[PDB]
Amino acid sequence: WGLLKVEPQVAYQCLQQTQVYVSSVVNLPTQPLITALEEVGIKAINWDGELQEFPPHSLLVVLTDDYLQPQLNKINQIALKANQPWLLIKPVGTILWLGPIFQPQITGCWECLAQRLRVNREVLQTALHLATTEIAKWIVKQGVEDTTPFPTLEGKVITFDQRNLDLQTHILSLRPQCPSCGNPNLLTERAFQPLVLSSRKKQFTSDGGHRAFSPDQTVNRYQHLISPITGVVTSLVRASDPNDSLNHTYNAVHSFVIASNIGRMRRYLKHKSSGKGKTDSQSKASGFCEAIERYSGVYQGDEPRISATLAELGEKAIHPARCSLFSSEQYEYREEFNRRGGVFDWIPQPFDETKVIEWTPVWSLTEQTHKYIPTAYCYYGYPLPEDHEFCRANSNGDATGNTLEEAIIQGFFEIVERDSVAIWWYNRLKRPAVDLASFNEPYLLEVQDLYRSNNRDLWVIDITADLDIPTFVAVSYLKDNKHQTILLGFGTHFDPKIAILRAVTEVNQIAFTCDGVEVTKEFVEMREWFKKATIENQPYLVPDSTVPAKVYQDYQQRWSDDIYEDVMTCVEISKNAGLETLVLDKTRPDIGLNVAKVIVPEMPHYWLRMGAKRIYDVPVKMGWLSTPLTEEQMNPISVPI
């Protein structure tokens, strides 16, 4: 009782004014905790939950076996209504959860923790003494002692395991969009307001692209979101690739990307997620950013939408076929194409304007107005009718950044990369090479030499489209082998140097995985590719020797000092090509790290989306072809990467 070093007998005065109402949720013995509480002098009286009003300086303790018991939803309503602090304890099982001191209007309520646990659970006497210690610490932290000399479990879950004797701390996050403790529809007011971009001049861009803040600092700041109970990223494995390779490193994260209803297949395969690889020490930062973007892209019911059909919306709505861009021939052969195709290139049902769907507002930058995109195309896991699965949400254009403008730039670069890759791949076009020596980067030369030493010839091809945004594809194939195992990487940026860096990082993220490749475990779609990825059979994968190789001085410099001007110049670049750039703010207020989805209608993905006239017309416009290619004359193989 004196280990709190607060007072020998003055602290008892606090115990003379504080009552602790102990209660059980589902069949827990309340008496032992009560007796433990009078053992140290705390006046504890049993409660059942019917009482709402409480005397000042009171704490309500509730015991449970699971943190998602429905009865808690009642208690969470009682506490918020009465503004009463309460503690949640799980004394049973091998793992003990001390739970947070739910203080209304200051810390998160129970609903925040329950929502995060649900989003995260898609996959004896010592408890009493620890609970007594935590309660006693809370008693003195509010009556006499100050904030600093009194650590408390307020808004903090302590997970203690006796079997391994290890203790972990999870930080409960107050969600401003929580239905119970906050504004339940903050997103619909945020989206309806016009989107405004604030200028933010960069300060340090020595390496890792044009970022105004260190991604390591971002991970350090957002480590409070890294938790398997009260967090959004499961962490767990963290780094996957060995740390010996300093030039290129990797790190893995666990999240949810696909929401298939097959439990058996989800049990082993769909669990965890991907996102791994960077030449800089920010591979873990990139994986964390991708996990954050995937978590922000999932549907949870708070998303802004309006139930209507295309007729009422008129010109304000973008037709789903204008974004998905599937050819009518693909639709009319949907069944057998889906039967022979993979999950990535699944062909959805044709969209009919007769039915009524939910449209999410988006900010059209080119017209500076509000358009409407089908919600199923924006958010993962959106429940669609079994007869109206007209589209499935993908990661194309979704991007992460500290500022919204940086996320917009990343998303637009992703869209441009996908368009250029599709145009080059499906036309089977030959494009000039790029000499890495002219790029003034010894890293490219040394990684090329390393790949050649490992019996893998590597080179880079320039596939820049009419947008004139420097984009490159790095291709590496194993020599003197029947299985070439062609590895591809794509990199697009205003700065050609970092575009080449992105391409080489993407191509060598798989290069070091050789000699023990995880094969069919998750590269099943890439298996048959390696059975046919031969340079002689794919002549477009080798550069056109006739045209001289492009150099670093062949590309104009377009990047500006401030990211706002980068967003602007991207807008005029898109406008000059007769395209409309739309931005959807996926940033969750409870997280704070900006996530944005950039949607451009006519821009296609690299999957079998043959309905886009860009693939047919852009090579003609640049003169790469004299006549547009017929749909059946294009490449019948999807892009493996």
Binding site for Zn ion (CB under 5 A): 109, 111-112, 178, 181
Q: Tell me which of 8, 70, 148, 165 binds a second copy, using CB under 8 A.
A: 165
CA dist 50 → 47, 70, 124, 163, 242 (Å): 8, 16, 28, 37, 57
104-112, 303-311, 321-329, 436-444 -> range binding a second copy (CB under 8 A): 436-444
Among 58, 69, 188, 247, binds a second copy (CB under 8 A): 247
Site string for a second copy, 188-207 (x = CB under 8 A): ----------------x-xx
> Hey, what are 58's tokens?
């009171």
Residues 6 or more apart whose Cβ sits within 8 Å of residue 633: none
Which of 30, 282, 330, 476 lies at the binding interface for a second copy (CB under 8 A)?
A: 282
Closest to a second copy by CB, 243 or 576: 243
Among 9, 16, 27, 125, binds a second copy (CB under 8 A): 125
For Mg ion, how many residues bind (rule: CB under 5 A)?
A: 2
Closest distance between a second copy and the C-beta of residue 125, in Å? 5
159 membership: H or E segment, kind and range: strand 156-161
Binding mask 366-405 for Mg ion (x = CB under 5 A): -----------------------------x----------
Fill in the amino acid letter for 85.
P
Residue 435, CB-side half-sphere exposure with 13 Å CA sphere: 12
The verdict on 262 binding a second copy (CB under 8 A) reads: no
Strands 594-599 and 471-478: unpaired
Site mask, a second copy, residues 78-117, x = CB under 8 A? ---------------xx---x-------------------
Q: Using CB under 8 A, pick the residue from 283, 427, 574, 587 that binds a second copy.
A: 283
3-state SS of 520-543 is HHCCHHHHHHHHHCCCCCCHHHCC
Under rule CB under 8 A, how many of the chain's residues touch a second copy?
49
Question: Dihedral through CA 478, CA 481, CA 485, CA 488, nearest 10?
Answer: 30
Rounded Cα–Cα distance for residues 110 and 69 (Å)? 11
Distance CA 609, CA 426 (A): 10
Q: Is 478 helix (H, G, I), strand (E, B) or coil?
A: strand
Cα 500 from chain centre: 25
Q: Which is nearer to a second copy, 213 or 299 (CB)?
A: 213
State yes or no: 289 annotated in a binding site: no
| Contact map string, positions 445 to 464, toward a second copy, x by CB under 8 A | -x---x--------------
The residue from 57, 129, 319, 613 that contacts a second copy (CB under 8 A) is 129
- Tell me: does residue 592 bind a second copy (CB under 8 A): no
When CB distances are held under 5 to 8 angstroms depending on the partner's kind, the choice from a second copy, Mg ion, Zn ion, none that residue 111 binds is Zn ion
CB of 168 to a second copy, least distance (A): 9
Phi and psi torsions of 606, nearest 5°: -85, 0
Flag whether 109 is marked binding. yes
Query: Residue 251 CB, nearest distance to a second copy (Å)?
Result: 13
**Comparison of 77 and 395: residue with beta carbon closer to Mg ion:** 395
166 binds a second copy (CB under 8 A): yes
CB-based contact 579:602 (threshold 8 Å): yes
- Order of strands across the sheet that contains 95-97: 95-97, 156-161, 166-171
Cα–Cα distance between 471 and 487 in angstroms, integer? 17
Which partner from the list Mg ion, a second copy, Zn ion, none does 407 bind, CB cut-off 5 to 8 Å by kind?
none
Q: How far is the CB of 625 from a second copy (least distance, A)?
A: 39
Question: Smallest gap, in angstroms, from Cβ of residue 493 to a second copy?
Answer: 18
Q: Which stretch binds a second copy (CB under 8 A): 73-81, 237-245, 503-511, 579-587?
A: 237-245
Least separation, in Å, of the C-beta of 290 and Mg ion?
A: 6
Question: CB of 60 within 8 A of CB of 79?
Answer: yes
Tell me: does residue 147 bind a second copy (CB under 8 A): no
Among 111, 134, 293, 506, binds a second copy (CB under 8 A): 134
615 membership: H or E segment, kind and range: helix 613-621
Q: Are 230 and 158 in contact (CB under 8 A)?
A: no
- How many whole angstroms separate alpha carbon 415 and alpha carbon 596? 13
The answer to whether 64 and 131 have CB atoms below 8 angstroms apart is no
Question: SS3 for 36?
Answer: helix
Which strands sit side by side in the sheet containing 86-89, from one edge to the other? 43-46, 19-24, 58-63, 86-89, 101-102
- Provide the minimum distance between the beta carbon of 296 and Mg ion in the complex, in angstroms, as a whole number: 12
Would you give the distance in Å from CA 621 to the centre of its chain? 36
Tokens of 632: 């059946």
The answer to the question of residue 167 lying near a second copy (CB under 8 A) is yes
- Total Cβ atoms within 10 A of residue 389: 13
Any known ligand binding at 181? Answer: yes
> What, of a second copy, Zn ion, Mg ion, none, does residue 446 touch, CB below 5 to 8 Å by kind?
a second copy
Matching residue, tokens 């991604």: 215
**Residue pair 511/451 in contact by the 8 Å Cβ criterion:** yes
Which of 7, 241, 280, 495 is in the footprint of a second copy by CB under 8 A? 280
Token pair listed for 456: 């893998």
Choose from a second copy, Zn ion, Mg ion, none: what does 440 bind? Cβ within 5-8 Å by kind: a second copy
Is residue 391 annotated as involved in ligand binding?
no
Per DSSP, the three-state class of 385 is: coil
Rounded Cα gap, residues 175 and 51, in angstroms: 27
C-alpha–C-alpha distance, residues 125 and 91, integer Å: 9
Ramachandran angles phi, psi of 209, nearest 5°: 85, -175
327 or 395: CB nearest Mg ion: 395
Residue 133 touches which of Mg ion, a second copy, Zn ion, none (Cβ within 5-8 Å per kind): a second copy
| CB 227, min distance to Zn ion, A | 17
Binding-site members for Mg(2+) are 290, 293, 414
Binding-site members for Zn(2+) are 109, 112, 178, 181
Give residues in contact with a second copy (CB under 8 A).
3-5, 93-94, 98, 124-126, 129-130, 133-134, 137, 149, 151, 153, 158, 160, 162-167, 169, 204, 206-208, 213-214, 216-217, 220, 243-247, 280-283, 440-442, 446, 450
Give residues in contact with Mg ion (CB under 5 A).
395, 414
